[PDB]
Design a protein around this ligand. Structure first.
Ligand SMILES: NC(=O)C1=CN([C@@H]2O[C@H](COP(=O)(O)OP(=O)(O)OC[C@H]3O[C@@H](n4cnc5c(N)ncnc54)[C@H](O)[C@@H]3O)[C@@H](O)[C@H]2O)C=CC1
Ligand SMILES: [Mg+2]
Ligand SMILES: [Mg+2]
Ligand SMILES: [Mg+2]
Ligand SMILES: [Mg+2]
Ligand code: NA
Ligand code: NA
Ligand code: NA
Ligand code: NA
Lengths: 494, 494, 494, 494
């Protein structure tokens, strides 16, 4: 029961947000944001650069000064504001979902029912954390009273991707604001619209000036300025593994700012012989094709047991063929276009590489429409570990199906990767599910399900998939600076 | 690697332990402790009563006074002391195990490899908690600094049973001492020897006088004196449901002392049709016959699915018949005698009741030896829920086997009880295990195993099986008195 | 900033609330609720009894059944509902404040600014806890996977007093609902109106029927029925020490339900010679006279160091004489009438007692008005520890000022009591504050302030002032039933 | 009481420790370790390089493989091993202390009473944590069972300094092993002896081969090899800010391994006018001169209020002049030599800079002996914020005394630094203590004391003094990898 969308929502925000005010780039330059479904320019957006980031960092630092409104505000009140923001986002839920679909390309139905719902749930979850992340009173040796204060890390720089514009912003702002930090956010050049509007709601909610500053623009410019800035205390990044390296190096070369990364992946989805066929097939399909295949934890390595391989592949091909591709604003559309031309060509390149390396193309493999960046749901069979499409993150509607024999075998092959963001296991057997979930080297292991996110459960990667965790209580750790206070007392007693 | 047992160890301790000194009862009266395997008197033991308890409490209260050695002692040092106690208990391991078997009746091998090992692991586990149960610093509203202090509850009265003399003593002392409390322990009249010897080790370990006081005696006298004492801050009890009511009533009638109970049970052991036959049989046998069936969490209700009922019963009867009953000091003995004549007659009474109520006697059902309190491994088939032997805790080697058809059926029948201490589920199916583990109303739900205790995991019951939890981190809660300190500050900041 | 009150608010709810519906007592009996300011009957209210309690318990038990809307509901949604209730209460804030003052007698300004504000903050705080009270995954020994489930305790019976009707209801519902429990609340016969209206808001908020049931009536009847009920899993009570004993005894004599108590006190307020005089005097006054002296943690023992005694007393007498007593609906009124005739007589009795035992009457000591139950702000000087007015809780506007010399002395005198709910220390010295905060045996120790309650900070008493803690994270413990699930795994690995 | 030391202890270990075996450098090269008291070479030590590091990493990785003795070992047993290692270090306490003094230069009395005691306390503290760092069971939305596994981060590369050879090793091993990780440690070229002997004790303790690997050698070679290694999962470093940057960049350039740093500092020690003169002076002296001034948290900026400045300086000078310098093995020696020639010259250079920039030399300022690296206790008065000695970490016996007027002023001046390791406040006033401890931007704030370390309390720096925290429960975070397991269930219930 989704409300009828406005297939052409008006844009009210397209500038740089600093101190609750809208500013044009110091250079007065602007960059175009394109609708991936048409290829046409939606509107111009202020191209923030280093000079702009410097204005944002100063605003943030000022808002973080001891004695300031944001610093003196009750922890509970910080929770009140987060809930207020969530309320305002829900009020403009219909509009934001449409604007999200317009700039990202994802189906409006999914934007409304999934993205916006998770955004609301994330902000409201962390709202409750605002006055509960307690410090500790420590029974240290000697005549002393020792305790820890959980203080805000400070000026936090947050660089987010384009796959989940609104959700990524919520995942970042939620924990940062709940812990009393200030933010300088750098949204993706491909999807800056929705984030900018939320900035308007952040002001409306009552958040003090400088607490949240958003600087739209390119990565090598605005993004790098934040990562290398001398007054940024912490940086959180979500994107490619390549840029993650640049971020951590920039942090080490600058002021040694704290860093947390959420990189890509090549998550394995293991389907045992005793799995519920119909369920496993549908979930495997969702596991990879969700959000145009543009998901960090996408099940891009579908391992299927030999005895059920053939039937599984058959059912998967059928499901992939019936997957409706088209205008994201039409309720029947299951898959919209890719985010941009760059990703569009990169995905086609991977498909071409899959053909060249001996992967058996089962369906799709080409452009789905003349206008826009639409790609057909592609499925590759008989994929081998050594193949490129089996190692590199495609980030598109390209499924890889591999065959295995033993449970010991699949573990080693699944773990044979530089990534380790997520993993899945489909089976009815207790011991098998427990053996695999423990053995698999991944941040999140789903059993008989996939892409099950909850603001209560932490999400992060192993190995080169990133470091640190987001969501849940763990999501507060990276946004907290621990201070130990040890006081001399006349005589310590238990 | 079980050392040769001294089949008649020397008794060095048989008096009341107060202020690290041995005292006779104020009345000079004594009571005999009997060897269950022979029925002969081992030795006399001081019969502590109210006046003796009053002395112990005063000693405890004094050792708990602010500024005393026990109160000023560093938390970490409290851990060192618990570790020292452990080492001393291990030094005299062989002796303790033998003395345990002599007074209790349980097999020497079991006392050594099971009971004493667990005792060591319990004290060592809690030793590590001594300086880790932190308080909190709370981000309260307004210009204040609020924090909590986790202080000792105070004088702790601990009344334990006879089924696991040494282990029950450790389960109580470990958390109590780790949190800096003082103890006035009332051991079972049937098995006071081993506990009294440990008191010697406690003194040798370096623990300040008054910190741990042991008063051997009867329940209506010494036990009630503790539960009704006006200066006892908290009381922990383990035994029958009947006395548990008396304890709670006494606490409410006296000074409203904090209370935690670990009562009996009629724990169900559910064997699904897809379970590992051999494993389930051996575990179900162990689940009920362990420690002469004198276990609080004994699986006295063995639910078996109809499709595998016949075979399971057959195998169970065979195992029950092969269970070696005899002298506990003999390496071949698997089942020793019952703790005493009262229990001996009570068990036989239940067996006679099982026969009169229509339960099918498959094997055993009578006295296993002329001398001592030995009973044959009895197994009843086609047991119905309404049967006495299916509702009341027998606490003996009397197995009950019930048949069921559906999973929804077994859950309802398993939960239909005033008890809820523990339960078990044997199956290879993931969903079945998860369904039953969540639906069963019990403190502990074992999956494909039984009687799996770990100092790391909490143990306690639902409904009338008790309140509160022992073992694990949870075991510290009842021994902690929380104090909030809210201080006015010049200006509160995050 | 306080909206003009409706001095004669309309009563819309006066029956028994069960399954989201209003019912008359099965006996059809009703009892009058009196306005303490005029002594006139406000209206009649359904007199609930045992049969009515049975109906409520059955409704709550049904709503708690596995698979019910309340049990299946997402933890996050539980928080959503609590947040909704809070919003509804704030909407009807002006109304509830007036109704609270009408039935209780406390100043309308206080009802609006303090009571209702604290109610909103309590419900909102606990709303955030709904999906954050995590269980644990334990690294148990052997090849096992052990974890704990934090399940609801079940059918919770809550008996609240009359000194803070709305607030006491929130302190009870907040933690109970946040943890998924069901409630059968028995409000005070003197102040049932506000709680009943809130029940209307509970239904409006969307809470499933049976989740919260309110039964207005007397103690020996309705209250006892809850405490003795065989199907009530836990009971929380707040009131007199005498009734607290009856409650714990009833629990032990019935089904061994879990019990937490919040009783009275004789809280000591220590004023050191180096304290801020003007601040200590005003705070010492507030500490005692707040809410007509009807506060559990009222500073009924004001200890003042000799060197500043005379000046402190002189200023305290002046402040007490300037305390405006009168119509609680008038903005100038500081002190309204006592809750009822019974309390009125009880306080007058204590005042006479103080005069008879040698306490020096410095001001007041008699009836403040002809109509209603108004008593003059009374101050006793040169009070000694042995005097009855120094040991027993008066619960009225009667201040006791005692003199002391050293800090070691005052600690001993302040701790020499069967009560230990709260205490305070007024001093500028760091060491003195830490020495006293540690030494005082009280649940809450305020430093340079008093009556500072925060939903984030736990509240409860030591000794006979109660057991267990309310508010903060600790407030969730008593409403949680811990379940351990130990699963056998193929091979356990770190 | 201190046992008579062997001024010339025998060296038993001087090679590379891998797989519990001693290996020579692959290149067969060795480096000399010098006795700072005489300048003479103690012995040659295997100069480990990249090739030796690779051998170590592979050994650790192998020992970390699923199903290995280290991975399958019960968490409780891991604590048993740490406790055992601690018992062995205590047995060889006298020897270790002597060898520590011989290689480092610190007084034997200090090494025995301070360093070794803290080492024993650190390892025993973490020993208790081994089986207590629980994961969580999360009440996520929908029909799912979500929980987190707290697994070991993996192969941990640890690089430690020379100021506290044994203690630094303990601070690293304790948390790493308690959580089940494997270590590749690179000790300081200046102090490799004691660490290597401990490795021998690690083997004797029963630790599996490959669990702990120690590779002695230089920084740019062995240290850089660990930081840039492709198979090292996490790196912990303690040393200069300069190398900290190198380590962070090396980690980002390689496999994006998790990084935590503990760098230098310019810790401010604020003495208010109301402080206890005698105590403040003695503590300020200790704050800076401890361990030859070679302490990361050394109070290198002594802020003293003008009203007491003159008297404070006078007393400090007298104390510095009386500080006995000489043979570290002599019981009367308070200050030994500096670690090496490099530091010796560096400190002498800073002293020269202090004179050049206008700082008032009050005492010392030159070489204290003809043989060895001894420096006279130097004190500079009237130091200004802009002076080099007031900004850069000297790491020697050079004290800086600065004068201030107001508390607001000292807060700003104290926080005006790129460092933020620790700070201290000396005052008798409660408000000032709380105001400053909250305002000071430092990882550890001491009140009326200094250098109070406790294994229970976290230690780490703000800003450029490092990231993350060591000691206490927080010290376990960096050595844990969080995995979320979300299982689909039939029907979720609270
Ligand atoms: N983990 C994830 O969910 C995401 C993964 N990716 C992966 O990365 C591939 C390429 O897509 P991109 O848009 O280029 O991802 P990216 O990691 O390069 O860019 C993402 C964010 O980082 C910013 N950025 C770019 N260069 C930067 C720099 N030098 N310093 C600081 N920030 C910088 C971008 O402007 C955007 O805000 C995708 O095909 C997919 O494989 C992309 C987005 C998200
Ligand atoms: Mg890029
Ligand atoms: Mg009995
Ligand atoms: Mg009454
Ligand atoms: Mg260097
Ligand atoms: Na776009
Ligand atoms: Na006996
Ligand atoms: Na009334
Ligand atoms: Na050296």
């Amino acid at each position: 029961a989704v409300p009828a969308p406005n297939q052409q929502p008006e844009v009210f925000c397209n500038q740089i947000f600093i101190n609750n005010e809208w500013h044009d780039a110091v250079s007065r330059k602007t960059f175009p944001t394109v609708n991936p479904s048409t290829g046409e320019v939606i509107c111009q957006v202020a191209e923030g650069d280093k000079e702009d980031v410097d204005k944002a960092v100063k605003a943030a630092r000022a808002a973080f000064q001891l004695g300031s409104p944001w610093r003196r505000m009750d922890a509970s009140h910080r929770g009140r504001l987060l809930n207020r923001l969530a309320d305002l986002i829900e009020r403009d839920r219909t509009y934001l979902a449409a604007l999200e679909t317009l700039d990202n390309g994802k189906p409006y139905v999914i934007s409304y029912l999934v993205d916006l719902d998770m955004v609301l749930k994330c902000l409201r979850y962390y709202a409750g954390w605002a006055d509960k992340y307690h410090g500790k009173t420590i029974p240290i040796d000697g005549d002393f009273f020792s305790y820890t204060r959980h203080e805000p890390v400070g000026v936090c720089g947050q660089i987010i991707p384009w796959n989940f514009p609104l959700l990524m912003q919520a995942w970042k702002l939620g924990p940062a604001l709940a812990t009393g930090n200030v933010v300088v956010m750098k949204v993706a050049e491909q999807t800056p619209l929705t984030a900018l509007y939320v900035a308007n709601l952040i002001k409306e909610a009552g958040f003090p000036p400088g607490v949240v500053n958003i600087v739209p623009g390119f990565g090598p410019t605005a993004g790098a300025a934040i990562a290398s800035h001398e007054d940024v205390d912490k940086v959180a990044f979500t994107g490619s593994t390549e840029i993650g390296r640049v971020i951590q190096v920039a942090a080490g070369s600058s002021n040694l700012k704290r860093v947390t990364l959420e990189l890509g992946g090549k998550s394995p989805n293991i389907i045992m012989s005793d799995a519920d066929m119909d369920w496993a097939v549908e979930q495997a399909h969702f596991a990879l094709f969700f959000n145009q295949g543009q998901c960090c934890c996408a099940g891009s390595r579908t391992f299927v047991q030999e005895d059920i391989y053939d039937e599984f592949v058959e059912r998967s091909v059928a499901r992939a063929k019936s997957r409706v591709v088209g205008n994201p604003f039409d309720s029947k559309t299951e898959q919209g276009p890719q985010v941009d031309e760059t990703q569009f060509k990169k995905i086609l390149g991977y498909i071409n590489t899959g053909k060249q390396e001996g992967a058996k193309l089962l369906c799709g493999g080409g452009i789905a429409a003349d206008r826009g960046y639409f790609i057909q749901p592609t499925v590759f069979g008989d994929v081998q570990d050594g193949m490129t499409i089996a190692k590199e993150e495609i980030f598109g509607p390209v499924m890889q199906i591999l065959k295995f024999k033993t449970i010991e075998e699949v573990v080693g092959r699944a773990n044979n990767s530089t990534y380790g963001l997520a993993a899945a296991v489909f089976t009815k057997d207790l011991d098998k599910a427990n053996y695999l979930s423990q053995a698999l080297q991944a941040g999140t292991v789903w059993v008989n399900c996939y892409d099950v996110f909850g603001a209560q459960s932490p999400f992060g990667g192993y190995k080169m998939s990133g470091s640190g965790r987001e969501l849940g209580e763990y999501g507060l750790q990276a946004y907290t600076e621990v201070k130990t206070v040890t006081v001399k007392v006349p005589q310590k007693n238990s």
